[PDB]
RNA sequence: AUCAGCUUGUUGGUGGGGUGAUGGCCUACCAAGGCGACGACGGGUAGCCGGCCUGAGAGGGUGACCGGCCACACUGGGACUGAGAUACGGCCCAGACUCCUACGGGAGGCAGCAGUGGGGAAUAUUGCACAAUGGGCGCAAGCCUGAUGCAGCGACGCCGCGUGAGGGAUGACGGCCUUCGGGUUGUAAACCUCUUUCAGCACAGACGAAGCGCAAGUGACGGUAUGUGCAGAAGAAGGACCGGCCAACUACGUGCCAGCAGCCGCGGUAAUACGUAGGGUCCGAGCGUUGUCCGGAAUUACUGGGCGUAAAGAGCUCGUAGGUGGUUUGUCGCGUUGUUCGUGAAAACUCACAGCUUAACUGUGGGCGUGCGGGCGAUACGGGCAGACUAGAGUACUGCAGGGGAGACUGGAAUUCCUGGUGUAGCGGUGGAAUGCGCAGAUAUCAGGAGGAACACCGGUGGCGAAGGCGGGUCUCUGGGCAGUAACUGACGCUGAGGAGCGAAAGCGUGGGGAGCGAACAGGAUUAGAUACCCUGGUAGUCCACGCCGUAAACGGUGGGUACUAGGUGUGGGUUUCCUUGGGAUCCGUGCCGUAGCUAACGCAUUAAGUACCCCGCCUGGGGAGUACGGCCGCAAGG
RNA sequence: UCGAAGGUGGGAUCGGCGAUUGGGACGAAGUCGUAACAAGGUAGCCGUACCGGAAGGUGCGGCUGGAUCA
């Protein structure tokens, strides 16, 4: 990935609606062997999404960098993924693991940060948190991680979720500290809201 | 798995065999 | 037959996650308490005792959603015999953040974490569902 | 966290000798009445 | 594994692994040098590597490489061999401080600086 | 436990003795215990703690300062004095050492504060005061105090401040790159105003003392801190790094050299990785290196790991301690839990506040002190005791299947030899041959005899056994399994550290037996050469009796038990409902395919590698090495 | 009576050195062969025994982590 800055005559770059969050994690060379010699292709783990909370995972394959990490943008673009928060945190501590990945994701109060490494970091930082505590435990890869630290994401359900699921009415469901949460992030939900139809 | 393992560990074994062949006797005599 | 209740909620983990509709078990006291809590928080539908071979049995209907989707994300056995878990008054551990519930036997009977916290009082734990 | 069952070979002291092999005897802490004989015991509850 | 299994005996930790045996948990040693020879590294670095062999205080032998370009020592030379790790010359695992007891700091060495030993120009 | 037994004042009793006090503390007698796989007795190391460091915590490391206990005072014994003794600057004795001696005999004891030598990578002055606080004696004054208070020394640590500020160009001199245009150093510099902390020189000069004192004075630190003045940018910046991780790149110089490096790895005349230069980055009175610890390391996994093939399931059972326990009524309150009392010194730690120009620092008030003991309460769960139950477990009864085992007797086909026929020159063997047996009568064929071993066909993805393993027949003795009824007992269950037993083949001992096959061992051939394959011969062995040994890819590469989780189709054992052998249903077995779920993948998949509980074994990078040393078993090989 | 040191005695146990010798690790490159990986040119491997300059070869039983398919 060089050589992006440029100033063009030509028709268009085509810049356009969605400008989402997009990370490439890694790229390593994916060499085959074939008759007389080796073929050197490209592999791009694209991470996109926009600050609500929805994520992309895509998988790039080309024999260009640049290439591969435009698919990746395609394939995560054609597979979204939401995932449901409390403010800008998480709602509770999950373990997540896709065959070797575990990734335990768990809650923190505001204003610690995304900690987490740097697979998980990219899937979190694209992603609506700002402040949750991960850690990613085994398989010390990129891959893996992303993918586990996305079915980590789809062990989470809302609050309201689970309530359904008993038939029990809230506050029944979740304790009081989590419900003063929702009435903070709302407010100033309501609060930015109302000063952005202004 | 792979049989190299196991033919690492037998050529250290066939080796010790000889090598209590040729001090068979110098042990008896050298312990008694 | 070396724990009563790693059986009865291992059944209803087979059961559950097994697509199954009713599941039938030996009934017990304490069977009968964990289902009278999982009766009270709505992780079941509804439980009843049957006559049968010698003894009394219990079946229990499972609550499924909209779809086929399941009620009881999950069981795991923590007072297990060997490491049987003790928790005092100040954590009735909270499970998955609250969403999940803690299936704690006190002295007042079997209690949830919630009802272990308001009440004020603490002194086991069991499996805890979510 | 696993709940040890352990043993004590304490040393007691009966002088009326009333208690025998297999039996339910208290205990209460005296002074030391001799080289780790350090217990008296009073009220026998069951015989064998 | 089966808690009880580790209430009879389990899970103790491995072994220290000790560095370096230069002696008492020391950080640097002098010690008397003899027969400075230069050797013959493994296959894909091919040089000659400066080493001396030196019988540090703590009467044990060892053999240390001498950083820089050249030596000052000679045989019976006070030398204060610090423990370091050359991977190139197997077995050689201590380096000898340039700017020493006798062993003096190399000669117009003027960016490396602190190792070496170099005095700054007046 | 590569240390399994130790102990004879040792274990208890009585009478004395001793002590401030209980007591094998001591003694005389009597009794003969006591302590140990919850590790006794031995070996190694070590002062212990409030704490400190690290860590999300759990935990790991550590025991410096400060504080609390303990032990010792040249080495080793002993008492005395005293309210109280390891009696550091006491005594007595014996040692080792230093010193004085008129040679008769004496003297010493820094592990007090300084200080010297030595050892060492390394650790300070032979300081000043009792002004303050503590201590002693004294009626008091007062005297003593290397405790203490302070000072000196070392960037040894932590914190704070300084080495100037503002202006200043289409950006000078110089430097080094360059595409030869220029670009960087660089608003930085020179210059122009301004301000001076901190060092400098002046003069003033403390608090610490609601103190002591009957004397009139008294502060070691100290003419220090600190004030108010004066002069002037005036006296004040360095170290590492710039391949990757990992903020930061260009040229020149050497071109597998000289060197670099924490790992990966850089040097073979165009190195952003070596050396020098510019330039950048990061820190800053510091910055790098080495060592030691925690972290990252879920890499000893309680929280928080694993064992089909990656390291890892004992060859297989039986069973001692141990761990674990179905249904149900009562009782106890040992586990658990609630509450209150006591305690967890101070300091630290954390929160708030106050004090020093701020901070480090110090103080005040909370919390912490995750614990332990006492009182009172609760009884679901665990447990104890006392009971009850029949589903687990075992027994009885009726059958049923089977190379389960041992002993005994016996059967035929085939190979070899033997005697006798019939009968001649080849047979045997090979990829092709030759050693070889023959021509003395072989191979071939017929009759008879000996002797040994293995059991064609049935017989296979089939049966039985715990696993090894088990197939000619018959008889004798004996083991287990399955189903059916439910007659009995009433939780008697599960697992099982060590332990005993069984355990292919090879091998070992003593005595038999020895047909075929056959290591070793010959010859032949092949080949460069065969110590090999292939050929001809061939001893131990293979066989039986009696014992050893204890190993295997002893493999389902899958410990044992239990409950549950879509099915489809074979086959083995047995009960029954229906058509009337067919089908169904059921309990136990063994295969092939297949969902869900699981797995790194292949695969597994109701005979789990799925979902859970109980107990055991075992793993912690590869070699070194299942080896040395030591012990145990063994006749030895060896395990 | 007890009793520190001293003396005599025979042992335990922890080490240091020892001529010679066994193996082990690394070295580049030397000599000798070619055992293994493809049916690796005799399928490989386990146990054990015997033999051989060496890798190894053979026997007895086992195993697929074996092949092509009579």
Not at chain 5, 74 to 92: A, T, Y
Request: a positive charge.
């Amino acid at each position: 990935r060089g050589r992006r800055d440029d100033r063009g005559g030509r028709g268009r770059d085509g810049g356009d609606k969605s400008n989402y969050i997009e990370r490439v994690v890694s790229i390593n060379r994916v060499s085959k062997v074939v008759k007389g010699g080796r073929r050197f292709s490209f592999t791009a783990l694209v991470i996109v999404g926009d600050g609500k909370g929805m994520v992309g995972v895509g998988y790039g394959k080309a024999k260009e960098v640049p290439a591969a990490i435009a698919k990746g943008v395609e394939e995560a673009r054609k597979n979204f993924f939401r995932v449901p928060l409390i403010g800008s945190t998480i709602t509770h501590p999950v373990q997540g693991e896709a065959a070797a990945g575990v990734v335990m994701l768990r809650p923190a109060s505001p204003g610690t940060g995304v900690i987490a490494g740097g697979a998980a970091r990219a899937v979190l930082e694209c992603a609506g948190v700002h402040d949750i505590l991960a850690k990613s435990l085994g398989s010390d890869n990129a891959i893996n991680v992303v993918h586990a630290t996305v079915a980590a994401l789809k062990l989470l359900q809302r609050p309201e979720e689970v309530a359904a699921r008993r038939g029990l009415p809230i506050e029944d469901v979740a304790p009081a500290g989590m419900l003063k949460a929702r009435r903070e992030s709302e407010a100033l939900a309501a609060a930015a809201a109302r000063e952005g139809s202004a | 798995g792979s049989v190299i393992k196991k033919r690492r560990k037998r050529m250290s074994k066939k080796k010790h065999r000889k090598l209590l062949r040729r001090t068979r006797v110098q042990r008896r005599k050298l312990g008694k | 037959m070396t724990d009563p209740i790693a059986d009865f909620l291992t059944r209803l983990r087979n059961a559950n996650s097994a697509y199954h509709d009713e599941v039938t078990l030996p009934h017990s006291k304490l069977k009968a308490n964990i289902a009278e809590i999982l009766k009270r928080e709505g992780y079941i539908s509804d439980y009843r005792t049957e006559d049968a071979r010698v003894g009394k049995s219990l079946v229990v209907q499972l609550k499924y959603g909209p779809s086929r989707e399941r009620s009881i994300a999950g069981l795991r056995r923590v007072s297990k015999p060997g490491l049987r878990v003790y928790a005092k008054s100040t954590n009735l551990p909270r499970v998955l953040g609250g969403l999940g519930v803690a299936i704690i036997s006190t002295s007042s009977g079997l209690l949830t974490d919630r009802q272990a916290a308001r009440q004020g009082v603490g002194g086991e734990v069991l499996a805890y569902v979510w | 966290g696993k709940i040890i069952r352990t043993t004590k070979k304490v040393k007691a002291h009966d002088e009326n000798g009333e208690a025998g092999i297999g039996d339910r005897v208290s205990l209460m802490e005296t002074r030391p009445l001799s080289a780790t004989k350090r217990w008296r015991l009073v009220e026998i509850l069951e015989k064998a | 594994p089966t808690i009880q299994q580790l209430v009879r005996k389990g899970r103790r930790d491995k072994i220290a692994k000790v560095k370096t045996a230069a002696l008492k948990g020391s950080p640097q040693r002098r010690g008397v040098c003899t027969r400075v020879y230069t050797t013959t590294p493994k296959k894909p670095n091919s040089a000659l590597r400066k080493v001396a062999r030196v019988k540090l205080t703590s009467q044990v032998e060892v053999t240390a490489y001498i950083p820089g370009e050249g030596h000052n020592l000679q045989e019976h030379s006070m030398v204060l061999v610090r423990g370091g790790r050359v991977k190139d010359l197997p077995g050689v695992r201590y380096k000898i401080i340039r700017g020493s007891l006798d062993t003096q700091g190399v000669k117009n060495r003027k960016q490396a600086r602190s190792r070496y030993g170099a005095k700054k120009e007046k």
